[PDB]
Design a protein around this ligand. Sequence first.
Ligand SMILES: Nc1nc2c(ncn2[C@@H]2O[C@H](COP(=O)(O)O)[C@@H](O)[C@H]2O)c(=O)[nH]1
Ligand SMILES: Nc1nc2c(ncn2[C@@H]2O[C@H](COP(=O)(O)O)[C@@H](O)[C@H]2O)c(=O)[nH]1
Ligand SMILES: [Mg+2]
Ligand SMILES: [Mg+2]
Ligand SMILES: [Mg+2]
Ligand SMILES: [Mg+2]
Ligand SMILES: [Mg+2]
Ligand SMILES: [Mg+2]
Ligand SMILES: [Mg+2]
Ligand SMILES: [Mg+2]
Ligand SMILES: [Mg+2]
Ligand SMILES: [Mg+2]
Ligand SMILES: [Mg+2]
Ligand SMILES: [Mg+2]
Ligand SMILES: [Mg+2]
Ligand SMILES: [Mg+2]
Ligand SMILES: [Mg+2]
Ligand SMILES: [Mg+2]
Ligand SMILES: [Mg+2]
Ligand SMILES: [Mg+2]
Ligand SMILES: [Mg+2]
Ligand SMILES: [Mg+2]
Ligand SMILES: [Mg+2]
Ligand SMILES: [Mg+2]
Ligand SMILES: [Mg+2]
Ligand SMILES: [Mg+2]
Ligand SMILES: [Mg+2]
Ligand SMILES: [Mg+2]
Ligand SMILES: [Mg+2]
Ligand SMILES: [Mg+2]
Ligand SMILES: [Mg+2]
Ligand SMILES: [Mg+2]
Ligand SMILES: [Mg+2]
Ligand SMILES: [Mg+2]
Ligand SMILES: [Mg+2]
Ligand SMILES: [Mg+2]
Ligand SMILES: [Mg+2]
Ligand SMILES: [Mg+2]
Ligand SMILES: [Mg+2]
Ligand SMILES: [Mg+2]
Ligand SMILES: [Mg+2]
Ligand SMILES: [Mg+2]
Ligand SMILES: [Mg+2]
Ligand SMILES: [Mg+2]
Ligand SMILES: [Mg+2]
Ligand SMILES: [Mg+2]
Ligand SMILES: [Mg+2]
Ligand SMILES: [Mg+2]
Ligand SMILES: [Mg+2]
Ligand SMILES: [Mg+2]
Ligand SMILES: [Mg+2]
Ligand SMILES: [Mg+2]
Ligand SMILES: [Mg+2]
Ligand SMILES: [Mg+2]
Ligand SMILES: [Mg+2]
Ligand SMILES: [Mg+2]
Ligand SMILES: [Mg+2]
Ligand SMILES: [Mg+2]
Ligand SMILES: [Mg+2]
Ligand SMILES: [Mg+2]
Ligand SMILES: [Mg+2]
Ligand SMILES: [Mg+2]
Lengths: 97, 118, 51, 110
Amino acid sequence: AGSQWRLQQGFAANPSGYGPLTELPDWSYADGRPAPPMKGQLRRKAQREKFARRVVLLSQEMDAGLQAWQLRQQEKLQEEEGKQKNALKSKGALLQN
Amino acid sequence: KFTRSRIPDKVFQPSPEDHEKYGGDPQYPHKLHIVTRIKSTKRRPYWEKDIIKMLGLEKAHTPQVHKNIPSVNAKLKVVKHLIRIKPLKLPQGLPTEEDMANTCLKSNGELVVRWLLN
Amino acid sequence: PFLTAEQERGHAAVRRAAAFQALKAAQAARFPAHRRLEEQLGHLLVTRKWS
Amino acid sequence: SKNLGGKSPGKRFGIKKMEGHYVHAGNILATQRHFRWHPGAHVGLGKNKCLYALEEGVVRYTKEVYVPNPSNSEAVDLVTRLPQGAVLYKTFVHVVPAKPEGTFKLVAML
RNA sequence: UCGGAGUACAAAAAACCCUCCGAGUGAUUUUAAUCUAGACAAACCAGUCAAAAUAACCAUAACAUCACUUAUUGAUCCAAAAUUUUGAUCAACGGAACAAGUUACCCUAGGGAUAACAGCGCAAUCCUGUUCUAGAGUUCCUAUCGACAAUAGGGUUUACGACCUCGAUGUUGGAUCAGGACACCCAAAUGGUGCAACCGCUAUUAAAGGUUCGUUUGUUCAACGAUUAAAGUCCUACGUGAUCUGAG
RNA sequence: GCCUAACGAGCCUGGUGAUAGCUGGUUGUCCGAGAAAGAAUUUUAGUUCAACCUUAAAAAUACCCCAAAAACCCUAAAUUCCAAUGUAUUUUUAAGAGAUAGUCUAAAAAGGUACAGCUUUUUAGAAACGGAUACAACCUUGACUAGAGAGUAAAAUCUUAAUACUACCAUAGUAGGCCUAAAAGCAGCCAUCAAUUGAGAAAGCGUUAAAGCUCAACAAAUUCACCAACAUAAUCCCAAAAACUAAU
RNA sequence: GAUUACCCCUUCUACCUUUUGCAUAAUGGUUUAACCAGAAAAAAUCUAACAAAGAGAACUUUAGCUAGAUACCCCGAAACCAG
Ligand SMILES: Nc1nc2c(ncn2[C@@H]2O[C@H](COP(=O)(O)O)[C@@H](O)[C@H]2O)c(=O)[nH]1
Ligand SMILES: Nc1nc2c(ncn2[C@@H]2O[C@H](COP(=O)(O)O)[C@@H](O)[C@H]2O)c(=O)[nH]1
Ligand SMILES: [Mg+2]
Ligand SMILES: [Mg+2]
Ligand SMILES: [Mg+2]
Ligand SMILES: [Mg+2]
Ligand SMILES: [Mg+2]
Ligand SMILES: [Mg+2]
Ligand SMILES: [Mg+2]
Ligand SMILES: [Mg+2]
Ligand SMILES: [Mg+2]
Ligand SMILES: [Mg+2]
Ligand SMILES: [Mg+2]
Ligand SMILES: [Mg+2]
Ligand SMILES: [Mg+2]
Ligand SMILES: [Mg+2]
Ligand SMILES: [Mg+2]
Ligand SMILES: [Mg+2]
Ligand SMILES: [Mg+2]
Ligand SMILES: [Mg+2]
Ligand SMILES: [Mg+2]
Ligand SMILES: [Mg+2]
Ligand SMILES: [Mg+2]
Ligand SMILES: [Mg+2]
Ligand SMILES: [Mg+2]
Ligand SMILES: [Mg+2]
Ligand SMILES: [Mg+2]
Ligand SMILES: [Mg+2]
Ligand SMILES: [Mg+2]
Ligand SMILES: [Mg+2]
Ligand SMILES: [Mg+2]
Ligand SMILES: [Mg+2]
Ligand SMILES: [Mg+2]
Ligand SMILES: [Mg+2]
Ligand SMILES: [Mg+2]
Ligand SMILES: [Mg+2]
Ligand SMILES: [Mg+2]
Ligand SMILES: [Mg+2]
Ligand SMILES: [Mg+2]
Ligand SMILES: [Mg+2]
Ligand SMILES: [Mg+2]
Ligand SMILES: [Mg+2]
Ligand SMILES: [Mg+2]
Ligand SMILES: [Mg+2]
Ligand SMILES: [Mg+2]
Ligand SMILES: [Mg+2]
Ligand SMILES: [Mg+2]
Ligand SMILES: [Mg+2]
Ligand SMILES: [Mg+2]
Ligand SMILES: [Mg+2]
Ligand SMILES: [Mg+2]
Ligand SMILES: [Mg+2]
Ligand SMILES: [Mg+2]
Ligand SMILES: [Mg+2]
Ligand SMILES: [Mg+2]
Ligand SMILES: [Mg+2]
Ligand SMILES: [Mg+2]
Ligand SMILES: [Mg+2]
Ligand SMILES: [Mg+2]
Ligand SMILES: [Mg+2]
Ligand SMILES: [Mg+2]
Ligand SMILES: [Mg+2]
């Protein structure tokens, strides 16, 4: 078994997980030309590609959301400054002083 | 009567020793969750079943990547007793468009960008 | 969490709206299939013999 | 045996529209047996203590001071027996109108 | 049949041959209209609210009020009035226009969905032990008991439940043959006695073997006669009717 | 009672294929989805609606849902309504049938015996071809096919069987004062001083009353010392056995 | 399941029906052969004709009319009446 040992060493808990024992092709022609790809390997590649695409999409969405929040806060600061900039000069209690 | 459970806030306040115990950065929280359903949803309430279904954890022992935002953290808190949560680590950065088809997710949580080159 | 409740507000909403619109379009594309002359005329081939 | 008549269906005396709900005119906001929620702005009171919106808008719930009708002998007695610093408070349900009263539209140039 | 409070602690709903209050209307005048948005509730039938607009009164209200106000009520059809309305402890209260008792002379279709016997669950009841000593025992709790209380166990009685059987598990008692348990009646080995001896009273250990014959009663029991070393308590479909009896 | 072997009323024929909410049966393969009950009812052995569900079709929001909001004497688990977010589900339209006689487990309750494999409500779960030896409901488990591949899950002998406390001498005012036949530390009531380096007008046995035997007191050494242990059933006990070779 | 090998080894509580639940000691059957049990087109769905009209007569029509295909068992009483 040794799933805990394999997890500690970094390998998959199952010897059939992404190891070279399964990722590599298991046969080829005696002439040296490569064999057609395995259906299981093709499906695993498709799933890994989908997972990577999802990871990239999630990271990009999180970055975009953080940037949008920062931009909103900055625009709030700018409009708060502009409200004071567009005001008038006080004359009520300042002219008698 | 058996109903849902409200988890008190002090449960999710990490101790300073917990960061070193679980290998987390005390300053910067991680960006992405790797969630893997371990236990079954049978003999569990329908709300837990529905949360598992909407989290994409219908199949067991298949990791799924999620965000680290409170909106999904609420559901992960609801079904935290049926899942294993790890941080997604990226030693070689995000996979580029030229490295999408040569990536893999190790059991220890780092998503390698170049997996069995050549 | 990586983001706060105020920071996550509407960070991914266009994607959800687009997904719902795609679901609606997929549902609305439901309609009977085309009937072609080949389908009707291919039944006569059951009596093809050798001259 | 000795106890009879204890069976009677519930009257569904409760709250129908919560805070933030967009209601139209005439919608029953909440029904009650005793005065639990009091009507406020744009909320009328029926003969059976039910509360119905009079204008189309958004339902809100507030805590406000209670000044009873001076002709209400019981409430006036309660008020006059209240101590110096005591002010009554009640939960009032309001409807905040959304649409404007009307619009000025051009019809013809004469 | 209808309503209120608890069950049902905080939106709604929510049952019991569950615990308590009530209703089948009175008093008084303000005698309380038409039409229509939008809503509550709801299987359906029914029940509830209600803005704006209309005719009469202040030219500023009309939701009839009070009795916990919530319940004070009944569908079609059909009968009667003067055409507008009315009529049911139809209270078995979603109501058949008008109908009882008995059957052991009974019949049929089913039910272990549902009782009587047995089994099964529980131990209210019953039976065993120990803990606690106030009291009896002349004095002295524990030689013999031991109230008020505690705790553990067995499944003999009655009851409780209705889980297996109603396309059948045939009943009391007795005859024949008995298997088993020990919570031992005798026989055997002992401890304490308020054990001088004989008789006795308790407790410990032990289940290979025994545990009578008769009058009355169908009797299990019970009373009585004569004896015995003793005439034990129970379980076994209250053992045993494809072995027997039919007294009940 | 008897009326041609069955008479609470003969037999035959016809109505007649009587009628059964009741029982029994209901005949090829494969695939998709798939339901445990709210209201009426001479009704609870049944039907008709609602809620679920199936088959097609239109659409658009559907569950999860942070604030904020939902009563007045006290009140828990938590509910209702809601953005965001994660998913793709939901609502209407047209055809519809089955079901409406339920079990346990966890939780809040009620009745009972704070009894049931008991009965009635509310929330959740289950009804494995693995485990709990056997097993409905308990635990593990998003249920296809072939392989003489692999990794995991729940799960496989449970805790104590315990309670010893030993020498050493105890004299005095005085039989303290009252009651009493007697009350000398001791049926009883009140005082509770004092001699000795050290001993209570005495904390338990004992005498009718005395005597006498101990405790505390000094003198001698002084391992440790507060509570805790509790019978049994009936055909024949019930895997066998094992206290140390490295086990997250 | 296997196996060189019939058993010996390991694993599986007959089948319908009725039930909350049956290996149940709840019902049914010795076996074979032959017979023995879903039937209707109002509204609807699909297909097609023609279409403000459809139908070979009588009707229906604010996209409708005409035609076709999709649907609803068997056995059993005690009884009642007439001759
Ligand atoms: N009183 C009354 N009788 C009615 C009604 N509808 C039908 N009926 C029937 O009409 C008949 C009247 O006869 P009555 O009782 O007057 O002699 C009874 O059979 C009664 O049941 C009604 O609405 N009221
Ligand atoms: N009323 C009802 N009966 C069911 C349901 N599921 C199964 N049954 C009944 O249960 C029996 C079969 O049990 P099961 O095979 O489902 O364990 C059959 O009598 C079947 O009709 C249900 O969801 N509702
Ligand atoms: Mg595969
Ligand atoms: Mg009530
Ligand atoms: Mg009710
Ligand atoms: Mg409603
Ligand atoms: Mg008005
Ligand atoms: Mg009735
Ligand atoms: Mg009725
Ligand atoms: Mg009713
Ligand atoms: Mg007689
Ligand atoms: Mg019969
Ligand atoms: Mg039943
Ligand atoms: Mg009996
Ligand atoms: Mg019997
Ligand atoms: Mg019985
Ligand atoms: Mg039996
Ligand atoms: Mg009982
Ligand atoms: Mg017991
Ligand atoms: Mg005495
Ligand atoms: Mg017995
Ligand atoms: Mg039964
Ligand atoms: Mg029952
Ligand atoms: Mg029977
Ligand atoms: Mg039989
Ligand atoms: Mg014997
Ligand atoms: Mg003995
Ligand atoms: Mg003896
Ligand atoms: Mg014997
Ligand atoms: Mg008995
Ligand atoms: Mg017998
Ligand atoms: Mg026999
Ligand atoms: Mg007999
Ligand atoms: Mg015989
Ligand atoms: Mg006789
Ligand atoms: Mg005859
Ligand atoms: Mg018939
Ligand atoms: Mg019936
Ligand atoms: Mg299927
Ligand atoms: Mg129906
Ligand atoms: Mg909230
Ligand atoms: Mg929402
Ligand atoms: Mg029924
Ligand atoms: Mg039960
Ligand atoms: Mg349930
Ligand atoms: Mg099921
Ligand atoms: Mg098994
Ligand atoms: Mg599964
Ligand atoms: Mg001295
Ligand atoms: Mg001494
Ligand atoms: Mg004994
Ligand atoms: Mg079984
Ligand atoms: Mg059934
Ligand atoms: Mg049964
Ligand atoms: Mg049986
Ligand atoms: Mg059975
Ligand atoms: Mg039967
Ligand atoms: Mg059988
Ligand atoms: Mg059968
Ligand atoms: Mg048979
Ligand atoms: Mg037709
Ligand atoms: Mg007749």
